[PDB]
Amino acid sequence: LLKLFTTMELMRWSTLVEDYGMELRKGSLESPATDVFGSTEEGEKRWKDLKNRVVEHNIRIMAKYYTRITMKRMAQLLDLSVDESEAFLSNLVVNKTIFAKVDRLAGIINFQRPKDPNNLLNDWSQKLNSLMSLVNKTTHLIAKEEMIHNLQ
Amino acid sequence: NRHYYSITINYRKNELEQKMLLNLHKKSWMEGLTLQDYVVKEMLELAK
């Protein structure tokens, strides 16, 4: 459960079927696994919520990542196919708080979502970081060079 | 001025100190390390 939540990295739905469907037969507690998974009229709606969990498990880290990957590669790394991608990603683009990017044009998508409104942070990051690290390069490299010629 | 008058006070040179105060002053205010800024993208709108 926690491993499905720390940095999350991908998941396979069938390995989850294994790990959390052998718990519906293995008994130590048996009633919460019944109420969440073993039940049908609500437990199967919670299986649907588990499908929400596996697809949001996809979508959260794929909103964190994947700048310039294609689409069939996307669906096969979603572990759910392209029609399943339009279903399973329409019902989380109705979340309408993650901005992503797809195109067709033959079946090929792209990325870099904000269309880069930046020439500013290039200067900021690049030049301020590099120039201040270079003014540190004096203050501490000649410090260590003077140290290694204190000890010589 | 009933029994008072000011006096001359010059601010005389210290060759031991004047050029190095100038060194402190200038070479610590010309970019500090002289390598730092050599803001810029919103003063566009501010200046226009």
Tab-separated table of C-alpha atoms in Angstrom:
chain	number	residue	atom	x	y	z
A	1	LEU	CA	0.000	0.000	0.000
A	2	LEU	CA	2.717	2.469	0.969
A	3	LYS	CA	4.984	1.309	-1.881
A	4	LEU	CA	2.125	2.182	-4.235
A	5	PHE	CA	2.396	5.730	-2.822
A	6	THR	CA	6.113	6.518	-2.415
A	7	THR	CA	7.254	8.051	-5.784
A	8	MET	CA	5.012	5.434	-7.434
A	9	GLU	CA	7.237	4.943	-10.487
A	10	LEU	CA	4.614	2.850	-12.531
A	11	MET	CA	2.338	0.034	-11.603
A	12	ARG	CA	1.067	-3.173	-13.115
A	13	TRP	CA	-2.607	-3.776	-12.493
A	14	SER	CA	-2.261	-7.568	-12.611
A	15	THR	CA	0.468	-7.619	-9.954
A	16	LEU	CA	-1.993	-5.661	-7.827
A	17	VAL	CA	-4.613	-8.298	-8.730
A	18	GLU	CA	-2.179	-10.889	-7.340
A	19	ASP	CA	-1.095	-9.075	-4.173
A	20	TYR	CA	-4.578	-7.798	-3.295
A	21	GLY	CA	-6.669	-10.696	-4.509
A	22	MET	CA	-4.778	-13.302	-2.580
A	23	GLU	CA	-5.765	-11.248	0.488
A	24	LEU	CA	-9.467	-11.855	-0.249
A	25	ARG	CA	-8.879	-15.576	0.252
A	26	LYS	CA	-6.124	-15.432	2.874
A	27	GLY	CA	-7.673	-14.806	6.272
A	28	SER	CA	-6.438	-13.016	9.354
A	29	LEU	CA	-9.046	-10.230	9.387
A	30	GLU	CA	-11.255	-11.069	6.336
A	31	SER	CA	-14.065	-8.544	7.101
A	32	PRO	CA	-12.391	-5.299	5.844
A	33	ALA	CA	-11.104	-7.022	2.698
A	34	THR	CA	-14.670	-8.290	2.265
A	35	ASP	CA	-16.185	-4.842	2.804
A	36	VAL	CA	-13.772	-3.170	0.373
A	37	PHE	CA	-13.045	-5.882	-2.217
A	38	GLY	CA	-14.951	-9.078	-1.418
A	39	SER	CA	-18.272	-7.260	-1.519
A	40	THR	CA	-20.011	-6.787	-4.853
A	41	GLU	CA	-22.704	-4.081	-4.747
A	42	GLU	CA	-20.344	-1.680	-2.993
A	43	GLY	CA	-17.103	-3.644	-2.948
A	44	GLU	CA	-17.110	-3.776	-6.736
A	45	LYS	CA	-17.668	-0.025	-6.796
A	46	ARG	CA	-14.588	0.061	-4.596
A	47	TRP	CA	-12.902	-2.142	-7.211
A	48	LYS	CA	-13.863	0.625	-9.641
A	49	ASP	CA	-12.321	3.077	-7.198
A	50	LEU	CA	-9.242	0.831	-7.228
A	51	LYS	CA	-9.258	1.196	-11.008
A	52	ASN	CA	-9.411	4.939	-10.382
A	53	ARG	CA	-6.406	4.436	-8.108
A	54	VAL	CA	-4.373	2.561	-10.704
A	55	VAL	CA	-5.173	5.058	-13.443
A	56	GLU	CA	-4.519	8.065	-11.222
A	57	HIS	CA	-1.370	6.244	-10.171
A	58	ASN	CA	-0.504	6.463	-13.855
A	59	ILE	CA	-1.690	10.045	-14.377
A	60	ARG	CA	-0.052	11.671	-11.325
A	61	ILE	CA	3.481	10.585	-12.193
A	62	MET	CA	2.834	11.023	-15.926
A	63	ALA	CA	1.802	14.595	-15.172
A	64	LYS	CA	5.038	14.866	-13.246
A	65	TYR	CA	6.988	13.416	-16.155
A	66	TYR	CA	7.093	12.268	-19.814
A	67	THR	CA	8.107	15.248	-21.939
A	68	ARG	CA	8.213	14.074	-25.603
A	69	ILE	CA	7.039	10.472	-25.623
A	70	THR	CA	4.639	9.075	-28.249
A	71	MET	CA	1.187	7.520	-27.761
A	72	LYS	CA	1.068	3.754	-28.346
A	73	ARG	CA	4.234	3.700	-26.259
A	74	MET	CA	2.227	5.806	-23.782
A	75	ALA	CA	-0.657	3.327	-23.670
A	76	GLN	CA	1.618	0.304	-23.333
A	77	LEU	CA	3.394	2.069	-20.478
A	78	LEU	CA	-0.032	2.909	-19.053
A	79	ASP	CA	-0.618	-0.884	-19.107
A	80	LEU	CA	-3.946	-0.044	-20.759
A	81	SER	CA	-4.538	0.295	-24.470
A	82	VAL	CA	-5.408	3.289	-26.646
A	83	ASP	CA	-9.208	2.974	-26.473
A	84	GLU	CA	-8.720	2.243	-22.793
A	85	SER	CA	-6.466	5.316	-22.824
A	86	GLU	CA	-9.257	7.526	-24.147
A	87	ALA	CA	-11.695	6.083	-21.601
A	88	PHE	CA	-9.256	6.005	-18.636
A	89	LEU	CA	-7.897	9.453	-19.520
A	90	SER	CA	-11.163	11.162	-20.398
A	91	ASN	CA	-12.459	10.277	-16.962
A	92	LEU	CA	-9.399	11.998	-15.439
A	93	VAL	CA	-9.244	14.926	-17.835
A	94	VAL	CA	-12.648	15.647	-16.343
A	95	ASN	CA	-10.505	16.275	-13.251
A	96	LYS	CA	-9.524	19.332	-15.416
A	97	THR	CA	-6.613	20.308	-13.153
A	98	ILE	CA	-3.795	18.513	-15.010
A	99	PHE	CA	-2.686	19.996	-18.332
A	100	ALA	CA	-1.232	17.371	-20.684
A	101	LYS	CA	-0.646	17.188	-24.427
A	102	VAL	CA	-1.736	14.794	-27.163
A	103	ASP	CA	-2.031	15.058	-30.938
A	104	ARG	CA	-3.016	12.547	-33.537
A	105	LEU	CA	-1.783	13.474	-37.085
A	106	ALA	CA	-1.056	9.731	-37.647
A	107	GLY	CA	-1.168	8.565	-34.048
A	108	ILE	CA	1.757	10.590	-32.585
A	109	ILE	CA	1.651	12.980	-29.603
A	110	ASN	CA	4.095	15.503	-28.127
A	111	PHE	CA	4.603	17.465	-24.893
A	112	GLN	CA	6.160	20.503	-23.133
A	113	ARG	CA	2.792	21.778	-21.904
A	114	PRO	CA	3.094	25.588	-21.290
A	115	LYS	CA	4.478	26.230	-24.830
A	116	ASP	CA	7.540	27.807	-23.094
A	117	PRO	CA	6.722	31.434	-22.157
A	118	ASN	CA	10.335	31.783	-21.051
A	119	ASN	CA	13.394	33.723	-22.008
A	120	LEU	CA	13.409	34.997	-18.450
A	121	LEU	CA	14.218	32.045	-16.197
A	122	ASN	CA	16.835	30.983	-18.743
A	123	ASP	CA	18.705	34.177	-17.891
A	124	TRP	CA	17.777	33.879	-14.175
A	125	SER	CA	18.783	30.254	-13.593
A	126	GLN	CA	21.642	29.988	-16.106
A	127	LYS	CA	23.391	33.298	-15.623
A	128	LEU	CA	22.680	34.153	-11.962
A	129	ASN	CA	23.449	30.614	-10.757
A	130	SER	CA	26.529	30.217	-12.969
A	131	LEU	CA	27.940	33.692	-12.337
A	132	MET	CA	27.444	33.478	-8.588
A	133	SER	CA	28.956	30.011	-8.562
A	134	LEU	CA	31.871	31.488	-10.508
A	135	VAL	CA	32.324	34.283	-7.983
A	136	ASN	CA	32.319	31.506	-5.414
A	137	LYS	CA	34.962	29.689	-7.507
A	138	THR	CA	37.443	32.420	-6.608
A	139	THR	CA	36.495	32.660	-2.913
A	140	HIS	CA	36.746	28.920	-2.268
A	141	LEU	CA	38.956	27.428	-4.992
A	142	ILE	CA	41.736	29.895	-4.275
A	143	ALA	CA	40.962	29.249	-0.602
A	144	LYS	CA	41.603	25.518	-1.021
A	145	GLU	CA	44.594	26.234	-3.264
A	146	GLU	CA	46.022	28.461	-0.552
A	147	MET	CA	45.190	25.702	1.933
A	148	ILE	CA	47.050	23.081	-0.095
A	149	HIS	CA	49.968	25.500	-0.245
A	150	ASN	CA	49.696	26.094	3.493
A	151	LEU	CA	50.279	22.356	3.781
A	152	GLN	CA	53.157	22.630	1.272
B	1	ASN	CA	30.810	85.876	19.007
B	2	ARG	CA	31.350	87.283	22.491
B	3	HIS	CA	34.738	85.618	23.032
B	4	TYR	CA	34.199	82.815	20.514
B	5	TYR	CA	35.219	81.928	16.975
B	6	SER	CA	35.301	78.732	14.978
B	7	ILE	CA	38.552	77.221	13.740
B	8	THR	CA	39.847	75.665	10.522
B	9	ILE	CA	39.346	71.893	10.259
B	10	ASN	CA	40.687	70.244	7.124
B	11	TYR	CA	40.105	66.570	6.362
B	12	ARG	CA	43.701	65.709	5.653
B	13	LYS	CA	45.139	62.845	3.632
B	14	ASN	CA	46.366	59.531	4.971
B	15	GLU	CA	48.561	57.958	2.264
B	16	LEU	CA	48.612	54.830	4.432
B	17	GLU	CA	44.797	54.832	4.380
B	18	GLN	CA	43.291	57.002	1.628
B	19	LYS	CA	43.988	54.844	-1.419
B	20	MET	CA	43.009	51.702	0.457
B	21	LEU	CA	39.758	53.286	1.684
B	22	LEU	CA	39.218	54.115	-1.969
B	23	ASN	CA	40.026	50.461	-2.716
B	24	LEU	CA	37.434	49.278	-0.136
B	25	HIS	CA	34.795	51.742	-1.346
B	26	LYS	CA	35.143	51.420	-5.133
B	27	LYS	CA	36.339	47.826	-5.629
B	28	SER	CA	33.757	46.569	-3.107
B	29	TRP	CA	30.924	48.525	-4.747
B	30	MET	CA	31.773	47.874	-8.428
B	31	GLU	CA	29.875	44.541	-8.493
B	32	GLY	CA	31.466	43.588	-5.143
B	33	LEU	CA	33.770	40.901	-6.534
B	34	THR	CA	33.691	42.783	-9.895
B	35	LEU	CA	32.311	39.596	-11.511
B	36	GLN	CA	28.671	39.356	-10.507
B	37	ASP	CA	26.044	41.113	-12.664
B	38	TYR	CA	28.100	41.150	-15.852
B	39	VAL	CA	15.369	43.572	-12.947
B	40	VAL	CA	16.015	43.315	-16.676
B	41	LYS	CA	12.716	42.000	-18.047
B	42	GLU	CA	10.035	43.883	-16.107
B	43	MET	CA	11.738	47.270	-16.103
B	44	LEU	CA	10.761	47.034	-19.790
B	45	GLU	CA	7.155	47.671	-18.788
B	46	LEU	CA	8.167	49.976	-15.930
B	47	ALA	CA	10.284	52.165	-18.219
B	48	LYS	CA	7.700	52.225	-21.015
